[PDB]
Design a protein around this nucleic acid. Sequence first.
RNA 1: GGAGGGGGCUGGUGACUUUCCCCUCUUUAAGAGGGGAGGAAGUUCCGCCCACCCCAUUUAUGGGCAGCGUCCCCUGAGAAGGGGCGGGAGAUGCAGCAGAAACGACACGGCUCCGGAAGAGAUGACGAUGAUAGUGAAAGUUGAGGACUUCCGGAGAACCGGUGAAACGGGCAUCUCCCCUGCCCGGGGUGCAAGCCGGUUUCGGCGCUUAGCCGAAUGUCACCGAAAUUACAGAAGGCGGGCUAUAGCCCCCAUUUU
RNA 2: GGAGGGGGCUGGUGACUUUCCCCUCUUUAAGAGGGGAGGAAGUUCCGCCCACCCCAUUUAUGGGCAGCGUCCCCUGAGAAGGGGCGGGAGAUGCAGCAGAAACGACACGGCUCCGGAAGAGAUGACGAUGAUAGUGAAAGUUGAGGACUUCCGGAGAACCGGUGAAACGGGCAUCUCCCCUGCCCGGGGUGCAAGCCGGUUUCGGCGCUUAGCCGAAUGUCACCGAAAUUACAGAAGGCGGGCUAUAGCCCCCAUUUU
Lengths: 119, 119, 116, 116, 226, 226, 126, 126, 95, 95
Amino acid sequence: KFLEKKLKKIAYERIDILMSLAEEEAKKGNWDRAKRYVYLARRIAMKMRIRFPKKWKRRICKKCGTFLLYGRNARVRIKSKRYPHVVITCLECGAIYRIPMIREKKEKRRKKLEERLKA
Amino acid sequence: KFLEKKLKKIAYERIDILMSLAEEEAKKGNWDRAKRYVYLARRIAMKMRIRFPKKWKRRICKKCGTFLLYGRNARVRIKSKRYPHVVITCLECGAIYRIPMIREKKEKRRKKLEERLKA
Amino acid sequence: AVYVKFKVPEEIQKELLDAVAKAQKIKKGANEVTKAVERGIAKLVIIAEDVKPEEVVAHLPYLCEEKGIPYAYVASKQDLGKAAGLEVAASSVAIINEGDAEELKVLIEKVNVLKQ
Amino acid sequence: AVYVKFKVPEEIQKELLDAVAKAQKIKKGANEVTKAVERGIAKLVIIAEDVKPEEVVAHLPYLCEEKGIPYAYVASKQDLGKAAGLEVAASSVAIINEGDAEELKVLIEKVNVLKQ
Amino acid sequence: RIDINRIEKEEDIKLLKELKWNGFVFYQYDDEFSKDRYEEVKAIAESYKLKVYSGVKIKTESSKQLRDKVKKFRNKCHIILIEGGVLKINRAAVELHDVDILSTPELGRKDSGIDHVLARLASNHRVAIELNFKTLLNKDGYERARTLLFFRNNLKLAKKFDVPVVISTDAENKYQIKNPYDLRAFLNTLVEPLYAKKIMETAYKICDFRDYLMRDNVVRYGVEII
Amino acid sequence: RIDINRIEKEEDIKLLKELKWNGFVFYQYDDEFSKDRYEEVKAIAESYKLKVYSGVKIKTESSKQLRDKVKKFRNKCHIILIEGGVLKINRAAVELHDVDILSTPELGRKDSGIDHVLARLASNHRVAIELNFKTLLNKDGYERARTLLFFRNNLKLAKKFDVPVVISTDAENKYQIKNPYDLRAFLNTLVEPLYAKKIMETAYKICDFRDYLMRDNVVRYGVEII
Amino acid sequence: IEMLKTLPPTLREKKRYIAFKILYDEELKEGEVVNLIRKAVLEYYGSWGTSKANPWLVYYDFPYGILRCQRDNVDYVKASLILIREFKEKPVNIICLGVSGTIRKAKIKFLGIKKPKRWFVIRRER
Amino acid sequence: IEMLKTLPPTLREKKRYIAFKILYDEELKEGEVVNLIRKAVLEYYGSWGTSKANPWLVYYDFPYGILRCQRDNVDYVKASLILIREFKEKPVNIICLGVSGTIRKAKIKFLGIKKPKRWFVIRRER
Amino acid sequence: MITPHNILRHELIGLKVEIVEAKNKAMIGIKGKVVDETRNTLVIEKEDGREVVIPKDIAVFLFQLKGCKVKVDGRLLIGRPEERLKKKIKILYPY
Amino acid sequence: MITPHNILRHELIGLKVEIVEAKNKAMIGIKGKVVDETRNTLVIEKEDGREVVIPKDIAVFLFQLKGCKVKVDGRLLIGRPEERLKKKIKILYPY
RNA sequence: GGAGGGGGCUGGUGACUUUCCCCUCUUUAAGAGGGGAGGAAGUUCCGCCCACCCCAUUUAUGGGCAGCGUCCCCUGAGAAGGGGCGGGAGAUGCAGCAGAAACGACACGGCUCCGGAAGAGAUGACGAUGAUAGUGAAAGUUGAGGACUUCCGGAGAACCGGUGAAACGGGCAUCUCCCCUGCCCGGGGUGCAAGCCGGUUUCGGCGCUUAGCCGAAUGUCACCGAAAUUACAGAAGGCGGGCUAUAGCCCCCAUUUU
RNA sequence: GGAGGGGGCUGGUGACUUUCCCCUCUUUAAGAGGGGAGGAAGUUCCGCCCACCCCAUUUAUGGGCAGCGUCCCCUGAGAAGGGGCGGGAGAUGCAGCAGAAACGACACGGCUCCGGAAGAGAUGACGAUGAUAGUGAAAGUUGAGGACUUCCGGAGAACCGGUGAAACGGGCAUCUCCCCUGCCCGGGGUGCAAGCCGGUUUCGGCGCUUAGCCGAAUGUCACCGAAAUUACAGAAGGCGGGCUAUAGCCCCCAUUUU
Ligand SMILES: [Zn+2]
Ligand SMILES: [Zn+2]
């Protein structure tokens, strides 16, 4: 248990330094180099069975594996008419992934119901 | 002395069989073969320091070494006018040797003087 | 809590609220500030700190750093909308034309000192 | 003693002396018998045994054997000259024409039996 | 050129330095070792001109309970050396792979020195066989022949499987010390002049590695300076 | 395969024929030999299946007066054998060139077996050196070593100058008889397996030549039949 | 327990079995003939030559006997059998009968005619 | 007279001179040190190995000593010096000093410093 | 943090690495950061910009920590970057 | 007369000689008389008429006496016909 | 030119000794001649000849093998190595957590209709976390004196599910049958330590050998050659195929280098 | 293709050990590097450098070497090996036997003249073993009623001597001078065990070494190569020439053979 937790403290940095090295190389223009780093990061996650950080979770297309720089190779928008969600689409391959916030939208509905009943 | 005399009995035959073998080969026509035998006979005489036989003495020219066959390669004559002597001359080379009998002529002179004085 | 990269002082925090109220030529909304930074007319982007969920303004600091647009944070979402001129709170406000606040927006550009 | 090759009987020895006296066509001398044997007219050559020195008739047996002329010996030199017709002894006598002794000279040719 | 003997006085140690020897090993054949023997042994080394490496000894205890015990005792000394004729002690000594050398497989068992399977476990564990010369000194005629045929069987297994061989006089008194050259000549006598020379190097190559490991901060063949 | 020993009875001669031996030599080590020993020795040879060649012996007399004497005695027997430690007797024995073999150059002189100049006179005279095994049987430890180093000096002179070598047990009683194979194995031990085989042939090649010389009318290696 | 795995035939020793016989009037024991051989090897081979040859006696009931030696050094140990001269009141003279690679050929060539296989039948029974 | 011509240097033996020393408290005689060496050669070399080595002792006055052996077998006889353990009440331990091809280098390298030439001066004088 | 004990479990990518000893004479003396990593081959880009193919087993690397320098053989560094994190223990001996 | 004892002093010229053993395979089996003689070479003319060159040292000759036949090696027959008459003694050994 | 990988070949001649073994011959007992371990003999994953028993005497049924080269997938300095051979139907499994939902589809949440409650007619409710709002409603363009709603429950055509390796829909793996094309027909079970014979527990012979041992033989030296007794390794009824470890030289490829 | 003869080459690299030796260097005494027997070192037939003494200080005289290749002679299977270098004069030797006579020529026997004796004038003496008889008279042609002689002694122009290896005449061998042509000038004697030095009989150092020992070192293994440590053989101041013994391969020649 002690050697498992100390290895998890090591491997938490190994997904952190390899992803931050991928971020500064992706703005250089070498998209094939940044795809190599996260492929090592996606491979080292499943051997230890550890999860990705919440900040670096939405930065990678799940289909191809290119790092998404907002505006450079990524087109992000807020579509909130029907259901509130943000969409990331890779300009290289063309896959589409979305992040709905309906569970956080449900709280402000429930918070405003409690404010109307109290007032 | 005994080994010297027994070797002389041997070597007396060695000059005899080698000369008689030279005589029958000389009438065959091979004069070079008969010259080889007597050259071995003239060589073996001087190592032992033995003399030639009296019969085979006058048969060989002393210059060249060919066997003389009377009439074939030898011209023999009796010249008795001035001094009585017989001459052998080799038809091959041309040397001349003579045998005077003046010491035997002197005896019949001395024998006839004793017959005149007694009668 | 997560997308905030630097701690903003309180004395300069009102100067973000003073610059938006003095100018009143602004774009409100999370989509309109994203269109302003990619075109380059936006000189200053003001982001609230108490947003929930954080994904609606999480791309705002990463887009402002690559485009070269100065930005800073404000702690209140409701006070940003009141200075912008609305009774409803706005998550983010970008400035196009300062007008009288052109002398003020250079003083907000000392946030680059807070970056290093 | 030296040039004699075979021993001649006494009964045939007079028949050599009879053949020379009957014919009386003969050549006397050591030179004339040598000329007769090389020409081949000589049928029989008679050589004395008591010669001294032996070199005057030593070539007579060796020349008669090569030419193929039959020859035999007589013991006396004086009796050879008396049968030849001379008071002085002759060493050797060769026959050319036998005449009445042609029947006798075939009987002298049994000396070839004495040769082997 | 490394020698293993028991120090008594100064004069025999001064004698071995005058002839051929470069550095040798203190051989504590007891369960009672301390710093009192260690402060004297540095005085003999600095006396004329010498360097001494001290080692300890354990003998005839159990298989796996001796392994937990001597691993605590090796942290205070330089090297260790295990002896035993029992095969279950000889087999258990090689699995721990922290021992450097092993001795006496011929005087306790009196059957055969090294087995075939015992040499294969010494390959990946890197345990050397130590040859002794104290044994042949006080035997009889046939008894000298029996240990010598056991030694010839130990040389062919260490040559084929590449097991290191280190010679020792294993001396006790002033005069059992031998020179290295006759010891080289005795190993030249047995098999080869080439294999006799490499034995002296494996005597040397052990004491550099054990010293440099505990000299500085070296862990798993990695040194850290600056 | 030729053996040289002294016959006593029938049983030891019957024993040597059963194992390896083909023909052997009667060794009369006395000055009194006659036909009485010769009529018995043919009865032992025709007893089971054998062939025996009898030889005589002379010892410690003068140099040149012994040569005129033993040349009369050799006309009645087959072979002769001369022994002596004195070098003036050893030198005088080889010049007569009618002796076949010579023995004991190490027990009389006790200095060295064969000299360098002694081997060169044995070349054109064709005298062989005979090696003995009776000597090493009754020596001591160092005494066995001294005759063996003398024998190694005699082998190198006979190999370079091509001197024939014939081995003998030189036995006296029933049990000093050895087999030829250990005698071949003892000569294979000293120098070579090739030179050990040729020694047995020179043991054989002597007794054919000495027999065939006096078998028929053979004089100076020339035989006359018909 | 004392159990050693037998060496593979590439690594095992090469051996020959020396058949010999001591022919005399007096009797010899098994402990005597193992001692007189061992005294003979130390005098001829030496201490160094003993390990090269590895001499061993297996069995001795008759005046006959079977002795073990190496395959390359049959020639040197056969000269060791003949140089031993006496045993304390009485001579020694070992006459060899032959050598072979196994007990099976050595027991039937010179010693006997039949084959007993005794090592197999006493191990599983006892 | 007993006089033998010396062998030519192509045919002569190749020799080395072993300088050694016996370091002890008790004393040894010349007849003792020639016996303990000869007992050591018969145990190690054997009877066959003795003629191959040709051991010889020339001179012994001090605890030092000079010993003769062959050039090819210096290695085997040096192990013979160390295996001898005791002499009847008292141990033996021979320590070698070095080997050389002649007396002249062996007497000055380890034994002494000067050169005496004693074999030449006692032969012509006596 | 980066320690010499956990340097066998550390990711070599993003660390300045220079080689002091190697069997091949060209690979001695190059300095740079590691970009990619395979089982027995390190990929180091120089400050000049030349990508150089370096096997691990034949050379020794000098790693640059936060200030410190550590000398570790590449014989301890056998393995892919995936399974080296979980459990890889190697034993070396200088003989 | 011709004796086997004096056959080494006898003149070989005029004697029928045949060879039984020789190292060269052609010289075995020829029969004829000896015409000429040198130191180590015999000259034999066949009944066919072919002159054949025969060395003495390599073969053995079978001499034809008056009826008898003698076997003598040519190793005893070394020497010219001149000095062989005076004194020549040779010793041979079959080893 | 240097670490490495793959493929091929691995003996011949002469001498000694029947005391290295077998076989043959003659001969005053011993001699002469010939032959004598491999590419894996190791590993036991196989088949057949050979044997024995059971059912059957059948290409009617049915059983067994193959779909190669090529191509596909994975790993290394990318030469090379390893595995597999098409389709249809049925069943089970993809845990745990996460996700509306985890292998057939669904229920559930956004959309529409009905019922109940709350606020309100130049006001108030809501809305830049997106307002009346459209499109094949994944996605994308839109962006406010815009503006009539918000919540809960029930029923339904169409579209879409923040996770995770992998989803209103197609995959992956295993097992069993029916669809194919070609070839061959006794089908299973054990196995030479099988099986048979004198013997009748045990043993000897056979099965057994152009090496044929069994308490397990096949030895030593020299040399041409360069393929050589060096590495790995040693027959046990034979042959064929696959895997495994490597010496010497030849051929091919790579990297460093120039 | 097989016995044989002659000529040429005969080591290099790597490892171990200063305990195989020498030399050099540094250094917590031991390590590292380099070198280490030949074509004959054997044989002593030579010379010189090097040393010492005597005479001489001379190319005036005189001394020393060479006339090679080529050619001549002898011996072997006739390739090959060995010996010698022109001429003139003088002396000795070619024994023994044989021959008139044996090394300069002669005496002697056949030829001529003189003296003595014997026989004799159509006789007798002699003569086919040669008669009156000739030729530059060695040799060769001659060959009888041919025919006047035969012997001994002495003196002389021309020609020839049965033997023997070799002769009224030319050779051979040795020794000493005078005739030649070219080159070089101290001439002899001994010799490193010479000679010199501390020493003062004896010993250590020098003479001594790109191996330099002296109670006499120069070692072992592997390999390319094929010239290799195999044959013969081992330095002792160095160099040059000649003789002697032979391994391995290359080149040339012969015989047998086809
Ligand atoms: Zn993508
Ligand atoms: Zn003529």
